[PDB]
Write a protein that binds this ligand. Structure first.
Ligand code: PRZ
Length: 148
């Protein structure tokens, strides 16, 4: 079961809508994730937009207790890969921004643009359990026009 490889964002849910709309820090268009267990690190490559233009990021996080990872980006983040199937990853992340506000978010990742409903239903359930309403879910594939 390998989690490392190409991963593209299809949907994101957030307890704070200010963090996921147009040009927001967490409207994240993932491209790949590499879990380096020997060195207890994780490598994340994704695009985001500022001023409506795509910008690329390559971050390095550190493995912590309970299969969680810490990474700095728009404040401090602690995330976990809550679910993994042969076709998807569901990530749960808690962000504390520079102003100190806390936000919980969820993201569904896949190998391309063709979503499997089985994975999507699990994403909606994880999102609900985290107290995030359905109306707070954004369709990221629909918004991802950044480079491959
Ligand atoms: C790829 O990023 C994400 N994917 C889903 C929800 N939130 C984020 C923010 C980080 C840094 C994990």
């Amino acid at each position: 079961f390998e989690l490392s490889g190409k991963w593209i964002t299809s949907y994101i849910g957030s307890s704070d809508l200010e963090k996921i709309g147009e040009n927001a820090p967490f409207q994240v268009f993932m491209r790949s994730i590499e879990f380096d267990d020997k060195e207890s690190k994780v490598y994340l490559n994704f695009f985001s937009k500022e001023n409506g233009i795509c910008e690329e990021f390559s971050l390095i996080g550190t493995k912590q207790e309970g299969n969680t990872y810490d990474v700095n980006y728009a404040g401090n983040n602690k995330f976990v890969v809550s679910y993994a199937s042969e076709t998807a990853l569901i990530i749960s992340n808690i962000n504390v921004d520079e102003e100190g506000d806390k936000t919980i978010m969820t993201g569904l990742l896949g190998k391309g643009t063709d979503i499997e409903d089985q994975d999507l239903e699990k994403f909606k359930e994880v999102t609900r359990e985290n107290g995030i309403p359905e109306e707070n879910i954004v369709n990221i594939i629909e918004r991802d026009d950044c480079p491959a």
